[PDB]
Amino acid sequence: AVPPTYADLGKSARDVFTKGYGFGLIKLDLKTKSENGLEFTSSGSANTETTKVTGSLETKYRWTEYGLTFTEKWNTDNTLGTEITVEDQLARGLKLTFDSSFSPNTGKKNAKIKTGYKREHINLGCDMDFDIAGPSIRGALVLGYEGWLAGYQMNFETAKSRVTQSNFAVGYKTDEFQLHTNVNDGTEFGGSIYQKVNKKLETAVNLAWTAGNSNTRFGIAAKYQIDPDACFSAKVNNSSLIGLGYTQTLKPGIKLTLSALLDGKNVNAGGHKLGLGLEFQ
Amino acid sequence: AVPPTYADLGKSARDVFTKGYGFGLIKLDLKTKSENGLEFTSSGSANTETTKVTGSLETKYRWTEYGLTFTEKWNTDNTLGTEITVEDQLARGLKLTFDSSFSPNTGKKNAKIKTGYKREHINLGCDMDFDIAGPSIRGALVLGYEGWLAGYQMNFETAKSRVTQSNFAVGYKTDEFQLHTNVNDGTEFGGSIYQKVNKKLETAVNLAWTAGNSNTRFGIAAKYQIDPDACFSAKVNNSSLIGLGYTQTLKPGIKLTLSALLDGKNVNAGGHKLGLGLEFQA
């Protein structure tokens, strides 16, 4: 029972809401990996409302002999990034990342070190940000006990010399069922349930509210694998939004996604959104 | 009066026949540009007959301070490409290109140098191929005189130590009218007329025939810009083929193209070819 990281608590439920939908976008993804050396991933995204087209490239080299990864990122905003990762090297479940960022636009340099350790019942992490205008430290811990999970997460900004962030999470996790709750900063409350109902159906419910407002946001979602080549997603929330999504494998390694978003009661009148995605592996 | 390269002779006419038609293909293109910085194009292409789907990614970086371009291509068939170009560097109208291809799939490695020089009345070029299985040299010249144009073009394959290609062209060229003719290898004869009739209409006629066969192939084509948002193309040839093409700007930066190709006999009762393109531009 190696538990997930603090950030991965409630992930499954989040995935049923997010994957298989891309509203107001034409998305194009190209991925290829070579035997042992390089790998390349590129994405293009055109926003049909803003007429803005975005692009990104990632180049990855895995030295599988020494648990090393070297990654280079580059996007349309001219941002460059580089990342070096060592995993399972000094000890099993240990991971050390060095990450550097550069902006030719602004000349903004950033550097980060990320460290992790995980093993049976425990998942820990510590990220160090060496910002010029105030370094910080993020620390997180998840403990596992017979399907139960408890996490704590905090951020310390050295400039203010003050904790600026304090989050708790509590949950229960099997492969077929997942209960997640959290309170951020004594202020934001979230809750979710995920269910793998059978081989073909996944479902999820989400709840969110805020101390000092009587209101509640909630939503319900599903994913249905019709056959091995076709997949349907549907969701609704109490802001009156409907999402629909359809994914079809055209050929091995090629998937086409169509998605739609509705608003209010004009389910035949108002301004909806469309989306189209194409993924190539 | 700087003349076009040998390859660009008759281009305008060829463009009226080729552009705005994509039969048997579903195309999706996403493009973004920076005059200063770089440009990016990514593409998806399905052949509706072969069920073959292609995907591509091109990156271009212009260092406008030193007349440099760097271009990178990558596709789904695993092919990689690289091209570096220097222009107007040592002298105005001089251009030098280094070109490399590599295939992890076909292992095929190819390298090329291309050189050019152009100025008033003259356009010359020399491309050098450093293939393992036979280096080759392509040389071309176009000379201009008062609207008239004459070109010669040849290829020498060092492996056979023999000229494998010898082409002549003669034309007349203004901005509204273009006459082009050529004979390849003393064997293939081509001729074309292009006309920019007005702001909205372009038209073209093509002729081709072969030494030792009495037959002739010809075609007529047109391009009509209806308004700034809509564009129609139509063509026919004497093999009884009809091409139709329609392009519509749906929103600024988004164009949709539909095309159809019909065979003669079954004009409205057989299997014809359709095509669909969507272009997204920043």
* B32 to chain A, closest Cα gap in Å: 6
| Chain B residue nearest residue A52, CA to CA | B282
Q: Residues of chain B whose C-beta is under 8 A from some C-beta in A? A: 28, 30-32, 37, 40, 42, 44, 46, 51, 53, 55, 57, 59, 74, 76, 78, 104, 251-254, 280-282
- Nearest-angstrom CA–CA distance, B8 and B182: 12
Annotated binding site of B for NAD(+): 241-243, 259-263
Cβ-count burial of A92 within 10 angstroms (0-12 exposed, 13-18 middle, 19+ buried)? Answer: exposed
- Nearest-angstrom CA–CA distance, A101 and A111: 6
Encoded tokens for A141: 């811990």
Residue type, B29: D
Long-range CB pairs of A118-125 (<8 Å, 24+ gap) are A118/A2, A118/A3, A118/A5, A118/A93, A119/A2, A119/A92, A119/A93, A120/A1, A120/A2, A120/A144, A121/A1, A121/A2, A121/A3, A121/A145, A122/A3, A123/A2, A123/A3, A123/A4, A123/A5, A123/A6, A125/A5, A125/A6
- Decide: helix, strand or coil at residue B20: coil
Question: Phi/psi zone of residue B108: left (φ > 0), alpha (ψ -120 to 50 degrees), beta?
Answer: beta
Residue position matching structure tokens 């090329």: B112
- Nearest-angstrom CA–CA distance, B249 and B281: 11
- Give whole-number Cα distances, A224 to A127, A221, A262, in Å: 37, 10, 20
Q: How many residues does chain A have?
A: 281
Encoded tokens for A47: 């926003």
Strands A230-237 and A217-225: antiparallel
Which of B28, B31, B280 is nearest residue A278 as measured by Cβ atoms?
B28
- Decide: helix, strand or coil at residue A143: strand
Strands B109-119 and A188-196: unpaired
**Cα Rg of chain B (Å, integer):** 21
| Alpha-carbon torsion, ordered A238, A239, A240, A246, to 10 deg | -90
Residues near B94 by beta carbon (within 8 Å), at least 6 away in sequence = B87, B88, B116, B117
User: Resolution in A for the shown PDB structure?
Assistant: 3.3
- H or E stretch covering B85: strand B80-87
Residues near A161 by beta carbon (within 8 Å), at least 6 away in sequence = none
Say if the Cβ atoms of B44 and A28 lie within 8 Å.
yes
- Nearest-angstrom CA–CA distance, A86 and A63: 10
- Nearest-angstrom CA–CA distance, A145 and A116: 20
- Nearest-angstrom CA–CA distance, B1 and A66: 63
Say if the Cβ atoms of A26 and B31 lie within 8 Å.
no
- Which residues pair with residue A191 across a beta bridge? A181, A207
- Nearest-angstrom CA–CA distance, A240 and A272: 12
Residue position matching structure tokens 């070190």: A113
In CATH terms, the fold of domain A1-281 is Porin (2.40.160)
Tell me the domain boundaries of chain B. Answer: 1-282
- Measure CA B181 to chain center: 18
Say if the Cβ atoms of A32 and B78 lie within 8 Å.
yes
Say if the Cβ atoms of B251 and A57 lie within 8 Å.
no
* A257 to chain B, closest Cα gap in Å: 14
Residues near B227 by beta carbon (within 8 Å), at least 6 away in sequence = none
- H or E stretch covering B14: helix B11-18
- Nearest-angstrom CA–CA distance, A274 and B257: 19
Annotated binding site of B for ATP: 11, 19
Backbone phi, psi, residue B187, to 5°:
-135, -50
- Give whole-number Cα distances, B182 to B4, B123, B162, B214, in Å: 15, 17, 22, 18
Question: DSSP letters of A47-114?
Answer: ETTT--EEEEEEEEEEETTTTEEEEEEEETT--EEEEEEEESSSSTTEEEEEEEEEETTTTEEEEEEE
| Cα angle, residue B258 at apex, residues B255 and B261 outer, rounded to 5° | 150
Say if the Cβ atoms of A53 and B31 lie within 8 Å.
yes
Residues near A225 by beta carbon (within 8 Å), at least 6 away in sequence = A199, A200, A201, A231
In CATH terms, the fold of domain B1-282 is Porin (2.40.160)
Which of B42, B51, B104 is nearest residue A28 as measured by Cβ atoms?
B42
Which of B30, B51, B53 is nearest residue A46 as measured by Cβ atoms?
B30
Which residues of B fall within a CB distance of 8 Å from A271? none
Residues near B241 by beta carbon (within 8 Å), at least 6 away in sequence = B261, B262, B263, B264
* A265 to chain B, closest Cα gap in Å: 27
